[PDB]
Amino acid sequence: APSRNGMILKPHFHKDWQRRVATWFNQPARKIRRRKARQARARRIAPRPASGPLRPIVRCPTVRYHTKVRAGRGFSLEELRVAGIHKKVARTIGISVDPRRRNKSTESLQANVQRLKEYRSKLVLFPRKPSAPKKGDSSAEELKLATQLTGPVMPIRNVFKKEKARVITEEEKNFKAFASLRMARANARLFGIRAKRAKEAAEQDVEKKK
Amino acid sequence: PSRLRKTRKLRGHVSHGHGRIGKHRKHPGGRGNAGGMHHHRINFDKYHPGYFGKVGMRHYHLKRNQSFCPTVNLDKLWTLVSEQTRVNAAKNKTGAAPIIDVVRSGYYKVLGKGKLPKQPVIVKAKFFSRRAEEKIKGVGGACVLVA
Amino acid sequence: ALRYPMAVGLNKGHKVTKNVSKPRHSRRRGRLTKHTKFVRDMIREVCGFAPYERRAMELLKVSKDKRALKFIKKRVGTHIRAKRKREELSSVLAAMRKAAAK
Amino acid sequence: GAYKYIQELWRKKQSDVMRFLLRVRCWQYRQLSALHRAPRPTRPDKARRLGYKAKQGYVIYRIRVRRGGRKRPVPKGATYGKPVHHGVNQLKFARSLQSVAEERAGRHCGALRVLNSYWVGEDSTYKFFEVILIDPFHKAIRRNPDTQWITKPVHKHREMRGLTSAGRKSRGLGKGHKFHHTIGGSRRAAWRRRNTLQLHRYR
RNA sequence: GGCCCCCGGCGCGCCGGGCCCGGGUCUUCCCGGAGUCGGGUUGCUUGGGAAUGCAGCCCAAAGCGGGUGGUAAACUCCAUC
RNA sequence: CGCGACCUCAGAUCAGACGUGGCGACCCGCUGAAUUUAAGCAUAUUAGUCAGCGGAGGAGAAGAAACUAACCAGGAUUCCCUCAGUAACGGCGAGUGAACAGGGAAGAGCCCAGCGCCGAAUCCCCGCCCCGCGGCGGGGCGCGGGACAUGUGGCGUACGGAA
Ligand SMILES: [Mg+2]
Ligand SMILES: [Mg+2]
Ligand SMILES: [Mg+2]
Ligand SMILES: [Mg+2]
Ligand SMILES: [Mg+2]
Ligand SMILES: [Mg+2]
Ligand SMILES: [Mg+2]
Ligand SMILES: [Mg+2]
Ligand SMILES: [Mg+2]
Ligand SMILES: [Mg+2]
Ligand SMILES: [Mg+2]
Ligand SMILES: [Mg+2]
Ligand SMILES: [Mg+2]
Ligand SMILES: [Mg+2]
Ligand SMILES: [Mg+2]
Ligand SMILES: [Mg+2]
Ligand SMILES: [Mg+2]
Ligand SMILES: [Mg+2]
Ligand SMILES: [Mg+2]
Ligand SMILES: [Mg+2]
């Protein structure tokens, strides 16, 4: 029974929940296990970045996130095609490739080509045998580093372009933003009917002739 | 800390602070929010006016990020930028006015609470209030819409 | 007179240049192939027509073509499938009519 | 190629030809036992799309299944309980008849490992099916690398666990908004995830 | 820290086999899983609401089609598999 | 009234293989209550929960979009944090109740049928030799059997592919 003021509150402890309580006494033991396993995987992939493969830059979806930029899942085929890396090979040099990515705008594409180009510059492809054929880099850039790269490879940093102080032309000052927005709202709202009434009026003008 | 709790001080006394006329029985009201309409009604309708009943429109697949529009007041617009933009300005003598990209700092709308200091600006933002616009103009600045 | 890009209204959103890529090969599925067409109609002269199809042809002949569609919708399910079927049946019926006139 | 023809013909099931044949097949099948090993696949085409291959150690049992729904096995009515659960007649099994068909083929030939099934007709009383089975221990399967996944002992009794194409369908899993139940492994697992008090160390 | 066993795992040599295994550029061809989808339905199920998912029964497809696009339907553009 | 092909079917203590029961903490498929709550109770709730049956593995299941979205767009599955006790359901009462985005753990992608080309170019079992043999394999040689054109193998599968 409720007594004088309080949130009329609904707890969800009506099922047999104590049968399915999940404690976290693992977690330290877990955290270590991951960490060992992590250090092992590094050591196995000896001069290769611990990170993984290189991954594309990509914008988030939705109005909310929109402005931010992450690492994506893998580079698109167009981006590999333009960079000039054979897709089947790109996997073998540590370049993530997804093939389900569309590519809508050319601003996101050229950026991601630039990424791969830069990667290919600062990559040290070892030759297959110790005897050195084409592609494989010099023994200088090899002895000076068979070094792993700690952290994510060529990390993405969401960055801003500084706008210098303008002078405010008599035109910026002239603008009526709030009004403009109200107008722009109503024209989206009313576009469709306006077009139907105009289509009606056009039919009335043609009907007047016959 | 049981040490501090009340049951330590109740030891010895019969009823354990629950009285002996009426006792501590199991669920004398009913369990939980039972009787909202009948027999607990008065509490509900003098501390939760409007619990019972429907109202307004349903909306099936609500996704909150569509309606994302965090606001900021003129009150503290200059807070977004380093003091030395607001200082290199009220100085300078070009009549420059520094830009304030509000969307960079994580606010989409610019609403209009507060006095804005007499010092020109260019506020870039997704949305503006009417008053926020007006105040900005009165300072001697320019609102700027961005996508 | 100052056309700032807006986040709201008709020609809204961030103004970005569009690449016009090759459309994915996945998108061309169901496109009727010359050899598949031949197979399809090669079998429509072996197997012939279904019973409901035949009944609809008889309605269409009579020029009672709404009742034909009402029948096909109840039979097939949707309107759009029923309409697309009624056109096929009307095409078949026409190519019989052209074939008879010789 | 002939298979595409066959395929398109079999889609004309209301046709005069295929209806004749289906009636004659279905008569014939009805006049045999509920489970018999077909010497070759009634539908060669279908079998290939489902992964049959006309080599040794692929088998095909044609299995009959009784049709219609599932009446509640309780004496008289007497589903004693709240009258939500009073139903006995108009209620319906979760798995399909085709799955039941496979499950029975699987039951019978324990060594054999159910791959996949297809349909061959239906009377009022029965349905008919054709379950492709495989020996996991016939060298021609063992040594062929592309099949030797079935010889692994995780694939014991696929049909029993809800893992053939048919018995997958009851589980109610696909990508996208039309699912969510089964957004872990399976129906049961999501419930499990959703009804765990995760009780953290620090809270 | 030591010695002794054994076993693993990886490094080099020899033999036996297999193995003549690319990429871009322009042309000519090639292309998709049916009693399934879909509909009606009844019963269970779901937060899923003029049907979220699974079922039985009846109907029962197409190929610039088909599916999705969280309010039933028709017209219509788009998007997306 | 024979002999011979094949088809569909039998029988063998025929040659050689496999399956059967157990365990069940975790896992997959079915099946499925009622105490209970609602201060009564029938829908609801308890709960797709206990009991019931089935089948597994060292994990299982899931998984390479008939996906999300509606953005300047993301890009298999699983797991955690969040979303969120929210959208929604509900004698709109009791009560119940997800998903996308965002940040992480991890990270890996592939193969058929078909359509086509290639003298079936493929597979299984016999038998003789050389090695190897306590996870029955390699190489060679047999007019030695069989499977297979009612389609085996190489190329190839939507991220396009072939010539
Ligand atoms: Mg990582
Ligand atoms: Mg007290
Ligand atoms: Mg007392
Ligand atoms: Mg009292
Ligand atoms: Mg009840
Ligand atoms: Mg289905
Ligand atoms: Mg329910
Ligand atoms: Mg709608
Ligand atoms: Mg067992
Ligand atoms: Mg009660
Ligand atoms: Mg009571
Ligand atoms: Mg009572
Ligand atoms: Mg329930
Ligand atoms: Mg149990
Ligand atoms: Mg598995
Ligand atoms: Mg799939
Ligand atoms: Mg997802
Ligand atoms: Mg909150
Ligand atoms: Mg529930
Ligand atoms: Mg082939």
- Contact present, D59 and D112 (Cβ < 8 Å): yes
Distances (CA, A) of D45 to C31, C60, D4, D7, D98: 22, 36, 8, 7, 18
Give the closest residue to A166 by CA, choosing from B111, B92, B133, B117.
B92
d(CA B113, CA A148): 54
Listed residues: CB within 5 A of ion ligand 2 = B 17
C69 CA to F112 C1' distance (Å)? 41
Substitution target in A163, A180, A183 with the highest count of B β-carbons within 10 Å is A163
User: Among candidates A53, A52, A38, A51, which has minimal Cα distance to A150?
Assistant: A51
Instruction: Report the Cα C44 to chain-centroid distance in Å.
Output: 18
Size of interface A-D (CB pairs under 8 A): 21
Report the C-alpha gap between C53 and C57 in whole angstroms. 6
Contacts of C13 in chain B (CB under 8 A): 147
Enumerate the β-bridge partners of residue B145.
Answer: B125
**Dist. CA D52–CA A201, nearest whole Å:** 66
Q: Cα separation of A171 and A164, whole Å?
A: 18
Query: How far apart are alpha carbons B53 and B15 in whole angstroms?
Result: 42
With contact defined as beta carbons under 8 Å apart, do B139 and B118 qualify? Answer: yes
Nearest residue of A to residue B112, measured between CA atoms: A178
User: Which residue of chain A is at minimal alpha-carbon distance from B129?
Assistant: A178
The answer to whether residues C63 and C75 touch, using CB atoms and an 8 Å cutoff, is no
Give the resolution to one decimal, in Å. 9.1
Nearest nt by C1' to A100 Cα: F75
Contact B108, B71 (CB under 8 A): yes
- Checking each nucleotide's C1' against the CA of A108, the nearest proves to be F72
What residues contact residue C63 under an 8 Å CB cut-off, 6+ apart?
none
Distance D140 CA to F78 C1' (A): 35
Ligand nearest to the CA of A55: 1
Q: Which residues contact A201 (CB under 8 A, 6 or more apart)?
A: none
Protein residue minimizing CA–C1' distance to F32 = D85
- Specify whether the CB–CB gap between D26 and D18 falls below 8 A: no
Cβ atoms of A126 and A137 within 8 Å: the answer is yes
**CA B52 from centre of chain:** 25
Going by C-alpha positions, the residue among C96, C92, C70, C94 that lies closest to residue C83 is C70
The DSSP call for residue D203 is -
Tally C–D CB contacts below 8 A. Answer: 30
- d(CA A56, CA A116) in angstroms, rounded, equals 8
Q: Are B143 and B133 in contact, with CB atoms under 8 Å apart?
A: yes
What was the elucidation method?
cryo-EM
Whole-angstrom distance, CA of residue B140 vs CA of residue B95: 10
- Is D15–C48 a contact, with Cβ atoms under 8 angstroms apart? yes
Closest Cβ opposite residue D201 in set A15, A17, A24: A24
Of C16, D101, B98, nearest to A108 (Cα)?
C16
Interface test with B, best of C2, C3, C4, C15 (most B CBs within 10 A): C4
Residues 114-173 of A with CB under 7 A from strand E: 130
What is the token pair recorded at C48?
Answer: 């012939």
- Please answer yes or no on whether A63 and B68 come within 8 Å at the CB atom: yes
Cα gap C92→C85, rounded to integer Å: 11
Which secondary-structure segment (H or E) carries A115?
Answer: helix A106-121
